């Protein structure tokens with residue numbers, strides 16, 4: 052089942068000193084308080100400023116093995132999918148919270164209202180992005 | 183025959199035979215890399231790699247683990263066969279191009 | 284040495300592995316050097332990705348599971364970090380996979396918050412790669428270093 | 431993947447074939463296999479070279495073992511198929527047969543020349559047989575070989591190789607046994623003056639580049655690599671196959687932004703030069719065959735527990 | 736001492752090329768890089784072998800213990 056989705060709009064796409072990964076900063080279009088930071092293999096999924104990305108975190112998709120004859124899963128609905136771990140939660144204010152994910156090192160920080168991020172737990176999770 | 187060429191390393195091969203390690207004498211990267219490339223194309227193979235214990239002992243270690251449809255020994259054989267067939271395709275193609283040249 | 288008492292002593296008391304820390308100050312004397320440090324900075328870089336084929340090959344080439352470290356008699360692997368458009372593993376996953384195959388299975392994975400020698404500024408804006416994070420035996424952030 | 435899918439996609443292109451060197455592309459093959467052929471061509475394709483040198487006399491300035499060594503480096507124009515392998519477990523008498531071994535002799539004495547044009551520097555006119563060449567290795571046929579090799583005497587592939595020099599009174603006298611061997615054992619057996627490959631360069635332009643930039647951009651690559659099109663006036667890639675990957679473009683600031691330099695990862699440009707015994711194509715064929723036998727010999731070996 | 740037979744890196748025969756290379760510099764009055772090219776030495780591997788050879792043997796040969804100086 053799905054734990055979180057929102058449409059985000061990208062502010063900045065910083066390639067840092069890498070050339071396959073970029074750090075993305077983006078804000079939600081639906082919540083004024085919900086913002087995002089995410090490392091992306093931009094060689095596999097190019098991103099430019101002002102892009103609008105739909106971003107979904109889900110606990111499962113309805114152990115890993117190469118795709119076979121007629122496999123169907125939640126991944127089919129999206130362009131870019133990553134698997135990772137929630138590793139830190141923090142109080143930002145009386146109202147807002149941030150959760151930290153690592154996808155084999157590519158880091159996400161998702162900040163938002165504590166009711167808007169209610170379903171997120173400190174477990175593993177899939178990340179799904181589509182344009 | 184020749185029994186000293188390839189042997190099973192029974193201390194890393196499971197009961198069900200869906201996982202196994204082989205030690206092949208007188209072979210380095212040349213065959214090893216080519217063989218793992220071929221084997222990994224087999225859809226029932228879950229894991230495969232080769233290694234060379236030491237540059238000074240002529241030994242090649244292949245590991246195969248399957249998803250349970252065929253045994254590890256099967257995958258080794260399909261891989262070896264696949265590799266042979268692959269060379270044929272190359273030889274034939276090269277021949278034709280030399281003729282047509 | 285020429286008799287089993289001396290054998291037992293050389294394997295259990297004066298053996299190299301018994302002597303990781305020095306008695307002077309109680310600090311490490313064994314570690315990797317040169318190529319291996321340079322290699323680590325590269326392999327564990329965020330820019331580092333590997334296909335299924337490469338990932339499995341790095342693992343088997345270094346594990347040597349045909350040893351006394353039959354922690355399992357089957358090599359364990361992680362799922363890829365990127366599922367789609369193409370299955371890719373990161374370098375940090377190679378490390379997690381290594382530890383996963385050589386630490387005891389009946390025992391929780393290591394937990395470490397540490398730092399390395401390279402300042403965040405060197406990687407770019409917003410980097411946290413100076414911070415070394417192991418959670419439940421997995422390298423979640425940071426590169427590995429002489430430190 | 432599937433062997434038929436491979437057959438349909440694999441392709442060979444032969445740019446130039448010659449008695450000494452071949453230039454050809456293997457397209458849509460995996461690097462592991464291209465590499466195999468390459469390794470095999472250098473190190474496992476048998477060849478004939480001098481292995482044992484028997485001196486009866488050498489009063490030249492060059493020491494025996496060194497002379498022996500150079501003779502071993504001389505590429506003999508011999509078809510390795512015409513020979514069987516030596517079994518190195520038999521005594522010396524049984525070891526060398528007419529199917530095993532080729533015998534070369536060398537027999538020079540240097541004398542002073544009376545008829546030297548007084549005040550001469552040239553050793554050809556000062557001395558008789560001052561210079562000893564590979565061509566001076568005489569092929570002495572043994573047993574059945576008088577017949578078998580009657581249609582193809584044993585000759586060094588490079589006759590004019592300088593082997594030794596002498597002065598009046600010095601002599602060389604030796605017999606050499608030449609046998610099958612492989613490069614992996616010793617490089618004198620390698621049948622190549624080198625087999626290697628390169629991946630086909632990929633120069634992809636990240637936006638049109640025209641006008642005075644086009645001319646500028648074009649000059650960062652060798653002649654013929656980059657074309658300037660008439661009409662759009664924009665630059666395009668003619669053939670990457672001629673590019674040397676100097677990365678010169680990446681120096682000039684204006685371009686470093688607009689070009690990525692890569693490879694077509696599964697497209698190998700092979701260049702094979704023969705040391706002189708077999709043709710390139712034969713050497714490449716022999717390697718593709720050698721790989722296949724490894725796989726076949728292994729499939730048929732019993733796996734001991 | 737004397738020309739090497741093969742190029743150390745290429746494997747390419749180079750020992751048939753010394754006497755001619757000298758004749759190219761001498762008779763045809765070419766520069767070194769033009770002459771090397773004319774003998775087929777393409778890789779810098781191989782050009783190095785002939786370009787920098789020292790025919791030291793021609794010195795050794797002047798001491799011949801087997802003739803009345």
Ligand SMILES: [Zn+2]
Nearest residue numbers: 742780781782
């Ligand atoms: Zn050279």
